[PDB]
Structure formats: C-alpha cells, structure tokens
Design a protein around this ligand. Structure first.
Ligand code: MET
Ligand SMILES: [Co+2]
Ligand SMILES: [Co+2]
Ligand code: NA
Length: 262
C-alpha cells in the first residue's frame, strides 16, 4: 500500500510543505534563553491557525495535547511543550512541525541552539544535518531504501555518534504516517525500490552517546538511556524522474531544492 502521488497531489504537498517550513523560519527570533517551550508552542499554533489558515496535524493525534513537538537536549522526540520548561544558554532544541492544508500534510523539523552553543551541541547538530543531506543526495528512482539507511548509519558512526533505531521516517500525504517505514540504519529487513511520485520523510535522530532510548511515564517523551544529547532534522520529499525535490526547504537550508542525477 505505498501510495503514488499524482501531479495534482504533489502541488498540494508543495503548499503544505512550504507552510510547515515557514513556521520554522518564523519562530527563530523567539528562541532565546528564558523563553518557555509552552510559549513557543502557542506562538506556533497561532500562526498556523490565524495567519496560515491551516491546521496542526499533531493536536489530538492519538491524544497529543499540543500543536508542535519541542525536544530539548537529551529528549529524543515528542517532547511536550510546557509553560514551566524554560530554555537556557547552551540548550539544543528540536522543533518538529506537521501542518495540514487542503487535506495534505507537510512534516519537517530542525535543531536550534539557544544562546551560546557548546562544542558538543554544535558538532552534534551539524553532523545530524549532514547525515540528512547525504541521504537526500542519494534519492532517485530505482534505488533501494536500504542503501539510504545504511549510508546514514555509516556516516554517523564514523563520526563517533549513534543512530536511534526505534523511530523512523515515513510515507506521508493525505495520511500523516503512511508506508513505507524509512529506516535510518542498515537492515536486511529493508527492501523497497524507489519510484517517482512517492513522498516520504527522512528524519534521523542521532545521539551523542549510545543508541539506547527510553519512553517516559508520560507516554510520549523519549529520552536517551545514557542521558547524552540527541539531535534530529527532518524534511518531506517527493521522488522525481531523476532525483528528488525537497518540499520543506527553508531559507537556511544549504542544499538545493531540486537534486538531479545524470
Ligand atoms: C507526536 S506526533 C509526532 C509526529 C512527527 N512530526 C513525525 O515526524 O512523525
Ligand atoms: Co515530524
Ligand atoms: Co515525520
Ligand atoms: Na534533543
């Protein structure tokens, strides 16, 4: 059941993708020491609803109570925004946004460094983004997803970090999480050949320490087992005839929006 988007579908995804990217571009100036994650969530929500006239796909999903996911430091993913959680100098934080517009989803995330960065945090964020970019450069019709997961893993590991196994990229479109599962590591279980019109996300979570993770009692928050820092970046893409197009590209991305192979 891997859905192939029509040209019309892709046009709608381009819109939803840009909206999502825009939320991330917009929030930047607000990310400073002393701000709470609860406030960031409110600002995002307002923008999405009142300015963009869109909807957050997260709010209510399986009961998720907020509009975006904000994961600080050792929180891997799904961090829940809260008025009591204040950002400090040196924190690294991921803001993951998924917007729905005209029934199509746009899913993307990036890391932000609060105030003065630490050596580890900067490095970790950089390597994580680079691992995503590497993956994007490989995307093209005919290739097996497995190769992509394997490349990410090799890269990350060579740099002294680890890749989280449990969470993965996913198809996306009218549905939030569609087939297929996009693994960020090498697995003999993976056997999917890419074809034009497929749309999915790549969103590697990398840990400064060991790969092990743990789910909190809240049922959402995921943290590293060894409390090391964790970083993630995400983009939604569409496979094209000779490469791919990045639907959630932002002003700060340093990769071209269209990647062509020849
Ligand atoms: C708690 S919903 C998490 C969704 C997230 N935006 C993803 O990439 O799947
Ligand atoms: Co996401
Ligand atoms: Co995603
Ligand atoms: Na984090």
């Amino acid at each position: 059941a891997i859905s192939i988007k029509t040209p019309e579908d892709i046009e709608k995804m381009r819109v939803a993708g840009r909206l999502a990217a825009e939320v991330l571009e917009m929030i930047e100036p607000y990310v400073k020491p002393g701000v709470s994650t609860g406030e960031l969530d409110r600002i995002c929500n307002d923008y999405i609803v009142n300015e963009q006239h869109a909807v957050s796909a997260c709010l209510g999903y399986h009961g998720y109570p907020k509009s975006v996911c904000i994961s600080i430091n050792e929180v891997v993913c799904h961090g829940i925004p809260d008025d009591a959680k204040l950002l400090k100098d040196g924190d690294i934080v991921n803001i993951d946004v998924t917007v729905i517009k005209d029934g199509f989803h746009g899913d993307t995330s990036k890391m932000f460094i609060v105030g003065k960065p630490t050596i580890m945090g900067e490095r970790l964020c950089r390597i994580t983004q680079e691992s995503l970019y590497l993956a994007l450069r490989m995307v093209k019709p005919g290739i097996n997803l497995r190769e992509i997961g394997a490349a990410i893993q090799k890269f990350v590991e060579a740099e002294g970090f680890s890749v989280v196994r449990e969470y993965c990229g996913h198809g996306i479109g009218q549905g939030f999480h569609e087939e297929p599962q996009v693994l960020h590591y090498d697995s003999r279980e993976t056997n999917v050949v890419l074809k034009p019109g497929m749309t999915f996300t790549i969103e590697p979570m990398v840990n400064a320490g060991k790969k092990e993770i743990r789910t909190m009692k809240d049922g959402w928050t995921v943290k590293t087992k060894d409390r090391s820092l964790s970083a993630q970046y995400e983009h939604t893409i569409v496979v094209t005839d000779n490469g791919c197009e990045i639907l959630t590209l932002r002003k700060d991305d340093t990769i071209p929006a269209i990647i062509s192979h020849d």
